[PDB]
Structures are given as C-alpha cells and as structure tokens.
Write a protein that binds this ligand. Structure first.
Ligand code: FAD
Ligand code: IRF
Ligand code: CL
Ligand code: CL
Length: 419
C-alpha cells in the first residue's frame, strides 16, 4: 500500500515535509485535486494554477514517479484515489485558513485511513499563542531560517491517472514550475540582492525578485528563499527577508483576527461612510481616473497579472482614500487580477494602504500621486510604458479634484480616528 501525497498550494518537490514524511515510510503516489472552491476564479489564475500542476507532473515523470490529478470536491476525490490505490494513509501540509480547516475536516471524515498533516514551512508560524497587530514585535521572534529539506532524488514507480485541462490565461505567463522559480531566485540573489534596499520602492518593481507568483502556489518555499538569502548575507539580504516576513505576518493577522476579512481591524473605522458609485468604481478598475500613476498601475495589472509593491500601495490607497470606494468590492477585484493574488496578503495590503489598521499605519499618510511618481520613476520610463496618454504625473481631467478629496478624507477620518 502506497502513501498518498496530497499537494495543495505547495506545488514543489523541494522543502516538502509531507512528501518526505511519506517517502521515509514507503512508496508514494502524489495527488492534486482541482477543486471548484479554488478554481472558479478568473482565467489568468485558473491557468497559472493548472500550468504549475502540469509542471509538477513533469517533475514527477522526470524522476520516474506518479502524480494523479483529479477534478471535483477534495472529500469526494481524496477518498476515491485512496480506494483506487489502496493507500494506507494520506499526507499533506497543515492549512490554518477557514477553508483549509473546513475541507481538511470533511476529508478526514470521509477517509477510512488516516490523514496526517504536517506544518508547512514558514519563517514564523501563523498560529502562535500571542496576537500582534504590529509587525515589529512579531518580527522579533524570528531568529533566522531553519535549513530547508532536500527534494527526493528519484521517486518510486506508480500508475498515473487524470487529465490537466488547458485554459486560456488571456495573457503571457511566467515560466511555470520550480525549475524556473529556483533559477529566478538564484539570478535575483546573485544580481539584484546587493541593491534591494535601495531599489525595492521603484514603480517598475524591477529591483525585486518578481517571485510572488511562485510563493502564492508554494512553488517556492519561503524557508528555502530566506535560508538562501541568509547564506548570501550582506545588506540587501536582511531587508529582503524582512519582506518574506511580511507574508507570514499576513497569515498571522488573518488567523488571530478572522473578522478582519469583514471589517477594518481598527474599531474606529467600522462605521466609515463608503460611497458606492458604479461610475467611479469602473474608472479606478479600468485605470481611467485621469491620474497618470493610477492608470499606469491599473493598466499594467490588467495586461500583466503583476504590479510592484509601490504601485499596489498607491493604486489601492487611491480607491479608498481619494475615491472612498468600499474596500471589500475593490480588494476582491484586485486579487482576481493578480497571478500571485492571495487572500490574506491582499487583505493585509488593503488594510495597510487603506489606513484601516494593519500595523498602526496612520490614517494621515496620504500619497500625493505626482510626488509619488517623481520620487519612484526618475525619468519617466515606467509611465511611458503603461500610459503614454500622459506627458507627466500631472493629472488630466481627474475623476475627482485631488485636494478636495484629500481634504475630504482627512476630515471624515479625523473624527472617527482620534475623536
Ligand atoms: C494593496 C496590496 C495588495 C497586495 N496583494 C498581494 C497578493 O495578493 N499576493 C502577494 O503576493 N502579495 C501581495 N502584496 C504584497 C507585495 O506587494 C507583493 O507580494 C510584492 O509586490 C511581490 O513582488 P516581488 O515578488 O518582486 O517581491 P520582493 O520585493 O522580491 O519580496 C520578496 C517576497 O516577499 C513577500 N512580500 C514582499 N512584500 C510583501 C508585502 N508587502 N506583504 C506580504 N508579503 C510580501 C512576497 O512573497 C515577495 O515575493 C500586496 C501588497 C499591497 C500593498
Ligand atoms: C489561484 C489559486 C488556485 C488554487 N487552486 C487549488 C486547487 O485547485 N486545488 C488545491 O488543492 N489547491 C489550490 N490552491 C491553494 C489553495 O488556496 C489551498 O487550499 C491552500 O493551499 C490551503 O492548503 C490554489 C491557490 C491559488 I492563489
Ligand atoms: Cl496525525
Ligand atoms: Cl530542517
């Protein structure tokens, strides 16, 4: 009887605790399930997920092993592959999210053999006893990466079942699979790391690793990335890893503060008067707001599935602070455009940028949008690639008056906030 290895958002061989835990007991057969709960989403993200599954099978086939791919509900398909293979047990990485817990609960009932879950590799775990809303106190618990675990060398032979359907992403995708992801990481650590801390805030995002699409499906392990930056060492190295830590902190917050997915973390913002308004939602959404910097950001995201940290925090704050659009609508639509879109992380971003209480980011911080453009794109190159309509970051029949609206937010917000 083979042990099944059930890969969810961990489409990799390297640093894979459930894969090893099973491999030491006996022969294995991996399984993915294409779950409608994750895959009724935009074409770009269905394809990104599916092509990474496809690369994961190529990775098994290449080491001589077997990856089933089945389609439908996990509590209906994990048991089916259990019966059809006669597995003695199934292995997977714990998920501390509300769907994770629900699916994993349901699978464990329908399975007649054990379901053994193992800690996913993290820099810091999301389910620690104490609850922090501030990053600094949280980041202090971190002492440096533990060593990552090897990949298998060669996998045992097993029968293979399932089709990986092919979907139109609608746009150009990165190279799928952990062979592409580990090449990308080593180029990055080798060519850009020294300057990361000087370069992280450009609008073109070209001083960073561009590896988020991979970290989102677990195609690259955050403990391998950190451990490796820690070996290279130097200055870039500390700051890059501090960013990986902002990803773990995003899961930390959503775990301890679940209601955060419904409402601002800061109680003082729970009654803020958003003004739904279709006309305006559409112009933010489609980058037609008249603000060079927001329409570049919104238009790159549409065409590419990717956006830099500094464009995102601008594009996202603008909706909340200058347009006063309701966060849930926006932040949903945002995450659907992103290959790397990740519920907790995108929520943490919206709550930070939007001044609703991640890390005590103060309401008063309002991006001046032309300023933001002059400090983070020094001779225009970015703005000309994504909206050459605009001759500079000077706004051009903006859908609101910026100061009227800066002055507006600061006003509504100072009552609420400290009144
Ligand atoms: C409005 C908002 C929404 C966002 N939504 C998401 C999302 O859905 N999925 C997502 O991956 N990132 C999201 N981010 C966080 C961050 O912007 C991106 O992960 C970063 O742009 C990825 O580019 P990079 O791979 O070059 O990062 P790098 O600069 O190379 O950073 C290394 C890695 O650390 C992690 N990281 C970096 N910055 C952050 C951050 N601010 N918070 C959490 N993790 C971070 C990422 O996994 C990143 O790939 C969002 C940020 C904001 C402001
Ligand atoms: C765009 C996208 C699509 C995904 N599709 C998944 C799927 O079809 N099956 C699955 O097991 N995991 C899927 N994952 C990861 C799930 O979110 C998973 O339940 C999480 O890893 C909990 O383990 C998934 C993630 C993302 I972004
Ligand atoms: Cl157990
Ligand atoms: Cl280890």
């Amino acid at each position: 009887g083979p042990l099944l290895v059930w890969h969810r958002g961990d489409l990799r061989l390297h640093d894979h605790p459930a894969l090893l835990e099973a491999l030491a007991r006996g022969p294995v057969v991996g399984l993915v399930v294409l779950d409608p709960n994750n895959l009724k989403t935009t074409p770009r993200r269905r394809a990104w997920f599916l092509e990474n599954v496809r690369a994961l099978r190529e990775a098994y086939r290449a080491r001589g092993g077997a990856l089933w791919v089945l389609e439908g509900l996990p509590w209906e398909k994990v048991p089916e592959a259990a019966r059809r293979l006669k597995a003695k047990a199934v292995y997977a990485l714990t998920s501390h999210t509300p769907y994770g817990r629900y699916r994993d609960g349901r699978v464990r009932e329908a399975l007649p053999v054990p379901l053994h879950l193992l800690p996913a590799p993290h820099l810091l775990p999301p389910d620690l006893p104490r609850a922090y809303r501030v990053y600094t106190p949280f980041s202090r618990l971190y002492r440096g990466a533990a060593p990552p675990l090897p990949p298998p060398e060669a996998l045992p032979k097993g029968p293979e079942e399932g089709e990986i359907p092919r979907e139109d992403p609608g746009l150009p995708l990165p190279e799928p699979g952990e062979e592409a992801a580990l090449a990308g990481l080593r180029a990055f650590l080798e060519a850009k790391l020294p300057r990361y801390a000087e370069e992280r805030d450009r609008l073109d995002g070209e001083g960073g690793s561009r590896l988020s699409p991979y970290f989102a499906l677990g195609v690259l392990s955050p403990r391998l990335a950190a451990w490796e930056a820690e070996r290279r060492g130097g200055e870039g190295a500390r700051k890059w890893v501090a960013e990986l830590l902002w990803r773990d902190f995003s899961y930390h917050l959503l775990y301890h503060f679940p209601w955060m997915a419904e409402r601002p973390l800061d109680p003082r913002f729970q009654a803020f008067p958003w003004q739904e308004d279709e006309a305006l939602f559409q112009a933010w959404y489609e980058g037609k707001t008249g603000v060079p910097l927001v329409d570049a950001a919104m238009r790159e995201l549409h065409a590419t599935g990717f956006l830099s940290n500094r464009a995102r925090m601008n594009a996202a704050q603008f909706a909340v602070k200058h347009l006063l659009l309701p966060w849930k609508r926006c932040e949903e639509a945002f995450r659907h455009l992103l290959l790397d879109g990740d519920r907790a992380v995108n929520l943490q971003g919206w709550q930070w940028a939007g001044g609703l209480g991640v890390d005590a980011a103060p309401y008063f911080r309002v991006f001046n949008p032309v300023l933001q453009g002059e400090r983070h794109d020094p001779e225009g190159r970015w703005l000309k690639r994504w909206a050459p309509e605009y001759p500079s970051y000077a706004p051009k029949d903006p859908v609101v008056d910026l100061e009227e609206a800066r002055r507006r937010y600061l006003r509504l917000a100072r009552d609420l906030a400290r009144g």
